[PDB]
Scaffold this motif. Structure first.
Motif, PDB file in Angstrom:
ATOM      1  N   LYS A   2      12.406  -0.269  -2.748  1.00  9.58           N
ATOM      2  CA  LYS A   2      11.745  -0.951  -3.856  1.00  9.58           C
ATOM      3  C   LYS A   2      11.620  -2.447  -3.596  1.00  9.58           C
ATOM      4  O   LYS A   2      11.019  -3.172  -4.387  1.00  9.58           O
ATOM      5  N   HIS A   3      12.200  -2.907  -2.492  1.00 13.03           N
ATOM      6  CA  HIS A   3      12.095  -4.302  -2.102  1.00 13.03           C
ATOM      7  C   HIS A   3      10.792  -4.532  -1.338  1.00 13.03           C
ATOM      8  O   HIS A   3       9.963  -3.632  -1.183  1.00 13.03           O
TER       9      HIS A   3
ATOM     10  N   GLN D  70      22.075  -9.025  -9.175  1.00  4.18           N
ATOM     11  CA  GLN D  70      21.329  -7.997  -8.459  1.00  4.18           C
ATOM     12  C   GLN D  70      21.049  -6.793  -9.348  1.00  4.18           C
ATOM     13  O   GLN D  70      19.950  -6.228  -9.314  1.00  4.18           O
ATOM     14  N   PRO D  76      17.544 -10.519  -5.392  1.00  5.21           N
ATOM     15  CA  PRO D  76      17.284  -9.402  -4.480  1.00  5.21           C
ATOM     16  C   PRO D  76      18.545  -8.974  -3.745  1.00  5.21           C
ATOM     17  O   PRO D  76      19.447  -9.774  -3.485  1.00  5.21           O
ATOM     18  N   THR D  78      18.544  -6.852  -0.668  1.00  7.65           N
ATOM     19  CA  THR D  78      18.455  -6.617   0.768  1.00  7.65           C
ATOM     20  C   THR D  78      18.182  -7.872   1.583  1.00  7.65           C
ATOM     21  O   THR D  78      18.296  -7.823   2.811  1.00  7.65           O
TER      22      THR D  78
ATOM     23  N   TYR J  48      12.771  -6.881  -7.036  1.00 13.49           N
ATOM     24  CA  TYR J  48      12.334  -5.596  -6.507  1.00 13.49           C
ATOM     25  C   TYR J  48      11.490  -4.925  -7.579  1.00 13.49           C
ATOM     26  O   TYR J  48      11.403  -5.400  -8.713  1.00 13.49           O
ATOM     27  N   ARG J  49      10.865  -3.812  -7.209  1.00 12.00           N
ATOM     28  CA  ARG J  49       9.916  -3.138  -8.087  1.00 12.00           C
ATOM     29  C   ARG J  49      10.667  -2.237  -9.058  1.00 12.00           C
ATOM     30  O   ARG J  49      11.277  -1.244  -8.649  1.00 12.00           O
ATOM     31  N   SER J  58       6.027  -5.523 -10.765  1.00 10.09           N
ATOM     32  CA  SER J  58       6.384  -6.524  -9.772  1.00 10.09           C
ATOM     33  C   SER J  58       6.579  -7.910 -10.366  1.00 10.09           C
ATOM     34  O   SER J  58       7.184  -8.765  -9.713  1.00 10.09           O
TER      35      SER J  58
END
Ligand code: FES
Ligand SMILES: [K+]
Ligand SMILES: [Mg+2]
Ligand SMILES: [Mg+2]
Ligand SMILES: [Mg+2]
Ligand SMILES: [Mg+2]
Ligand SMILES: [Mg+2]
Ligand SMILES: [Mg+2]
Ligand SMILES: [Mg+2]
Ligand SMILES: [Mg+2]
Lengths: 86, 78, 111, 97, 50, 137, 22, 97, 86, 119, 100
Positions: A2-3, D70, D76, D78, J48-49, J58
């Motif tokens: 999803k990133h 997060q 984010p 990752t 993230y989505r 988004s």
RNA sequence: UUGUUAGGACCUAAACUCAAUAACGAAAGUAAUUCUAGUCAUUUAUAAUACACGACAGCUAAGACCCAAACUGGGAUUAGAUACCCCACUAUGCUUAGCCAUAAACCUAAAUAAUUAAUUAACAAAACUAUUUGCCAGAGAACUACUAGCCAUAGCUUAAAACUCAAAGGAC
């Protein structure tokens, strides 16, 4: 998943040095511990086994770092003999 | 084992924190050497004998007296 | 149940005696400092104080056996309400049975 | 007896205790700019206290704020956000070439 | 004294709490002025705000 | 005024182009390097397959299928098919940590393709599926 | 520290379990 | 076993009471004089190499003996083997170190 | 109360540590094998492997050497400690 | 107690965003709450989505709502906000200000002998 | 006769206070190649390296300037019962003292 | 089948880095995030025939099922290979109710309050005093026989003797 793609673990090639970029990407993954993590995830380490390894590695890192200090500390006195002949 | 701390050390600690060590270098071979800090503590004591009770008064007055003597005291915060 | 349950409009024990002195306080401020906008733990500090007044001769002292017994009766009734919803909570079931046994021990020494 | 005998007292010259770069500061999950200074630019992994140099209490505070940010949609997981790549480097780690 | 001051402070602060009467007006004031909680630090420990 | 290892941030505007295409437009070379077979696939930025190869398709068998030289041949083969389709610059996303992880990237370079970046997408679960039991030897 | 005493008990329990099974 | 003789700790460095030193030194020098008066053998012993030449030069000036070199195991307990049948051992040993 | 490190603290103390304030004869700039020597040469090979990789892939050495991005196969110091073989 | 809502909203135009914040804050009041402050943090790209109500997102608008409510209302509020179609992700936490930065005098380290041979 | 307690209180070493980052005057008494053994009035001497500038000036008897760090270099190590000492002091040679 | 998907569904299962940390809990055990409930005062030690708990495996009923996996089948190896290695797939590991009550359940350290010198069997984890309870009395036979209790039925707890031996055992 999803990133966003191509931000994480991505390196850019400089002047067509594709070997230099690959060598950099490996040091990044090795430094972040991903290489060791992926190595140990091929098979299952039992929780008792995991704890024994981590306690041993911690104690090995303590005694190693301490031995480095003792050599560096005792290497200051390492110089040409000032009282040669006595 | 008794920690050796004289009463001058309270004054000396302040001087090193405010001005550091005197730009003149210590000579520990001269048995009667008088350092910049030791002159500060001798004057600080003299004022306190007069009867001044405020530490702030004794510290700023002592700096003025040494300035008249010509000693170069730099109030180095760095 | 028990005869007394603190009302929702009651102030917490920190400001229980402070707001009355203040000349005028808004309804909103009274509601923020009431037992409606507080945790259950605060409601138990009010129950204990009420029982100490109605039983102990000197409510200022909380180290007497009678005061310690009152402190354990509020906890025991709290643990019982906890265990009515959390039927399989074994840590609090131990807390309940150990407080009951502690109260019995103190009642023996008091007797 | 003797006037020049030493006097009991607490050490006048006692040196101050070193503080961490986040001593007596508020670590908030919404302050993602500060949290990003303790993760990896490439993988986004949280650094240990041997790299960050933080004390135990702040190491736990940063860890909890990162995980909260997060999981709530602020940071984010990752990677490090590219906006915060220019922020000061406070961690003893070098990655370039 | 401390509790009286704390109660008085909350009473002053309660002047600016949101209510049904001023809801729409307070919503538009918030949208007009965004807030930022972001700041960074240096090796020395100074707070750097961009 | 220096080179940046960090990929051009997506969504922004950059000054870097390769054959008149932006970073987001360069085709991607997906290399799956496992311990037995090294597969390679090249796709366009719209996710359309252009080339495919692997040690198996080249003709290696059993333990030879999982060597460095076997992946190099597979990379050269994937390059040749892609070069015919009209590909000069590739983004190398290398999944897997097998023997032909690097050799597959070296074959692609030998085949006339210009790698502009290397990404790694080796799956790392965050807590996931229990791995198979340790082998006794 | 050997495990010899544990091995005697190990065999007794193994043989006893097979006797009960029979 | 040295704490009786220590005047105190001046910022980490132990200071030796020079009043006990004066008393003890008087006794030690007094004893060393009667031994020398009676023609006893005195051996200076040290392994500090900075002062090896000074201590050997001192012994020569006094008229006595110095051993500043590696000490052989059994030199005193097994003297007759190492030195000869009727070797006379020292009557006093002064340990500068 | 309960310390995981206690399990392996005494085992790693003979494998990765020796007692006494003695430095090896070899470690000087200018025989019987000892266990301390194996420790005194194992830690140096790790420090030099860690420290000599912080020069090849870092900018201190030079601009061409930094561009070379030389990763290292292994580092091994001579028992006599006369020189090193990187 | 004092709770801080962290409300990520769907990316929308101001007319609809203001309506979403009125409908939301009204729900808090209907659950026995006393709203103290409303802050906006701006529209931005999500880390993230996030998929909510059969739509992938988004971009969202970040907002904070400071309020007081009984301990029993926290669950009812989060349940209601999750059913709204303009809420990407609602998160109620205890207000950070109610927690006060602790006072530290430095770092007195643990000795290594204690680390290895420990109580 | 002055007492030992008075001598210690009025001693230059007692006035110095902590020896970290202090400035002192030393004297070179022993030279081994480019290593200078400097006595600054303490228990242990320090050992510095001959500066590249004005190297020939640093001869025996030459008084210099120093920045003290420790009067004795010592450190207890893991499992030790006593501090290991190298019987040396720590200082940074700054340069020759102006005779004036 | 495979590779890619900045496509959809799923919310099963498990929680990287942090953790080089040493916290919480009576122990067992517990580390993705949030909220709710919640640990707290008996001077202190000392309890069973009572009460409440108790990893994993296992049993009972209804579900779950990504992956792992006893058993089983297929493939190799071997003199044989009912194994180690390969592949497939179950019981089972998950949830909800109840049972079962066992671990090298081991810091192989009962708890509590003192002392650090008037103190090396060895090794481990320095020595040692006082208080209270539990436990031990050569080895094997024996985590066995019989007895009693138990939701346990190829079970657990409790637990001998005959007989055999002159040793068994611990450290170096
Ligand atoms: S050293 Fe004070 S909070 Fe870290
Ligand atoms: K154990
Ligand atoms: Mg048997
Ligand atoms: Mg078979
Ligand atoms: Mg199954
Ligand atoms: Mg048992
Ligand atoms: Mg256990
Ligand atoms: Mg059994
Ligand atoms: Mg039985
Ligand atoms: Mg029976």
């Amino acid at each position: 998943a999803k990133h966003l793609k191509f931000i994480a673990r991505t390196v850019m090639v400089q002047e067509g040095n594709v070997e230099g970029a690959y060598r950099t990407l490996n040091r990044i993954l090795t430094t972040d511990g991903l290489t060791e993590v992926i190595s140990r995830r091929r098979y299952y380490e039992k929780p008792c086994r995991r704890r024994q390894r981590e306690s041993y590695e911690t104690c090995r890192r303590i005694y190693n770092m301490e031995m480095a200090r003792k050599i560096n500390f005792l290497m200051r006195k390492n110089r040409a003999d000032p009282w040669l002949g006595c | 084992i008794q920690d050796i701390f004289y009463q001058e050390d309270q004054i000396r600690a302040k001087f090193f924190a405010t001005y550091g060590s005197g730009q003149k270098a210590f000579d520990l071979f001269n048995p009667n050497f008088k350092s910049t800090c030791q002159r500060f503590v001798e004057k600080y004591t003299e004022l306190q004998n007069l009867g001044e009770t405020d530490e702030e008064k004794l510290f700023v007055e002592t700096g003025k007296a040494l300035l008249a003597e010509g000693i170069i005291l730099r109030r180095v915060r760095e | 149940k028990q005869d007394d349950e603190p009302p929702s409009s009651a102030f917490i024990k920190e400001y229980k005696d402070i707001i009355p002195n203040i000349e005028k306080v808004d309804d909103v401020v009274k509601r923020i400092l009431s037992l409606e906008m507080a945790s259950r733990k605060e409601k138990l500090k009010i129950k204990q104080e009420q029982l100490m007044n109605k039983i102990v001769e000197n409510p200022e002292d909380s180290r007497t056996l009678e005061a310690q017994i009152i402190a354990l009766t509020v906890r025991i009734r709290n643990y019982e309400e906890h265990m009515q919803k959390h039927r399989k909570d074994k840590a609090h079931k131990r807390h309940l049975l150990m407080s009951i046994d502690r109260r019995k021990k103190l009642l023996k020494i008091l007797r | 007896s003797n006037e020049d005998l030493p006097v009991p007292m607490e050490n006048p010259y006692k040196e101050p205790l070193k503080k961490c770069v986040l001593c007596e500061k508020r670590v908030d999950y919404k302050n993602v700019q500060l949290l990003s200074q303790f993760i990896s630019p490439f993988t986004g992994c949280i650094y240990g206290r041997h790299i960050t140099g933080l004390c135990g209490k702040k190491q736990r505070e940063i860890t909890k704020a990162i995980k909260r940010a997060q999981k709530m949609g602020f940071m984010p997981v990752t990677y490090k956000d590219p906006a915060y790549l220019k922020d000061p480097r406070v961690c003893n780690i070098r990655y370039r070439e | 004294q401390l509790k009286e001051q704390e109660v008085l402070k909350l009473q002053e602060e309660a002047k600016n709490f949101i209510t049904r009467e001023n809801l729409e007006a307070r919503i538009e004031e918030a949208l007009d002025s965004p807030k930022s909680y972001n700041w960074a630090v240096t090796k020395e420990g100074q707070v750097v705000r961009n | 005024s220096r080179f940046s290892l960090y990929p051009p941030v997506p969504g922004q505007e950059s000054s870097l182009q390769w054959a008149g295409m932006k970073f987001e437009d360069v085709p991607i070379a997906h290399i799956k390097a496992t311990y037995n077979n090294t597969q390679i696939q090249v796709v366009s930025a719209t996710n359309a397959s252009l080339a495919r190869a692997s040690c198996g398709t080249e003709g290696f068998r059993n333990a030879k299928k999982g060597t460095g030289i076997a992946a190099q041949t597979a990379g050269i083969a994937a390059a040749a098919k892609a070069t015919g389709k009209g590909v000069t610059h590739i983004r190398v996303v290398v999944k897997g940590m097998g023997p032909g992880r690097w050799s597959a990237i070296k074959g692609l370079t030998m085949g006339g393709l210009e790698v502009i970046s290397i990404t790694d997408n080796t799956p790392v679960p965050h807590x996931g599926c229990r791995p198979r039991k340790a082998r006794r030897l | 520290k050997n495990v010899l005493k544990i091995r005697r008990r190990k065999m007794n329990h193994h043989k006893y379990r097979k006797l009960v099974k029979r | 076993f040295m704490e009786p003789y220590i005047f105190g700790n001046r910022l980490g460095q132990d200071i030796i009471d020079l009043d006990q030193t004066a008393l003890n030194l008087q006794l030690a020098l007094n004893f060393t004089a009667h031994v020398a008066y009676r023609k006893g053998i005195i051996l200076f012993v040290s392994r500090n190499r900075q002062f090896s030449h000074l201590i050997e030069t001192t012994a020569q000036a006094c008229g006595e003996y110095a051993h500043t070199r590696y000490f052989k195991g059994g030199l005193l307990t097994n003297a007759q083997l190492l030195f000869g049948p009727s070797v006379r051992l020292p009557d006093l040993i002064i340990f500068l170190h | 109360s309960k310390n995981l490190l206690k399990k392996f603290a005494s085992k790693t103390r003979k494998k990765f540590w020796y007692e006494g304030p003695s430095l090896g004869s070899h470690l000087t700039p200018r025989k019987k094998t000892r266990k301390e020597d194996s420790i005194r040469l194992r830690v140096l090979n790790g420090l030099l492997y860690k420290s000599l990789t912080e020069l090849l892939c870092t900018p201190q050495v030079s601009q061409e050497v930094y561009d070379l991005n030389v990763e290292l196969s292994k580092v091994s110091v001579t028992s006599d400690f006369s020189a090193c073989r990187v | 107690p004092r709770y801080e809502l962290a409300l990520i909203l769907k990316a929308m135009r101001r007319p609809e965003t203001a309506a979403a914040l009125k409908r939301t804050i009204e729900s808090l009041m209907d659950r026995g709450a006393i709203v103290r402050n409303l802050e906006s943090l701006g529209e931005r790209a999500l880390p993230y989505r996030i998929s909510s109500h059969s739509q992938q997102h988004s971009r969202g608008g970040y907002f904070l709502v400071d309020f007081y409510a009984p301990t029993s209302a926290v669950e009812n509020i989060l349940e209601h906000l999750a059913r709204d179609i303009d809420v990407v992700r609602p998160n109620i936490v205890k207000h950070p200000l109610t927690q006060e930065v602790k006072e530290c005098d430095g770092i007195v380290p643990v000795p290594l002998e204690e680390k290895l041979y420990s109580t | 006769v002055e007492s030992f307690a008075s001598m210690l209180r009025h001693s230059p070493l007692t006035q110095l206070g902590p020896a970290k980052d202090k400035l002192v005057i030393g004297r070179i008494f022993h030279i081994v190649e480019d290593d200078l053994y400097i006595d600054f009035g303490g228990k242990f001497h320090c050992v510095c390296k001959r500066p590249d500038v004005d190297g020939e000036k640093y001869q025996r008897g030459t008084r210099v300037r120093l920045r003290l760090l420790d009067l004795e270099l010592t450190s207890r190590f893991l499992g030790g019962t006593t501090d290991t000492t190298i019987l040396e002091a720590d200082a940074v040679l700054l340069g020759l003292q102006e005779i004036r």
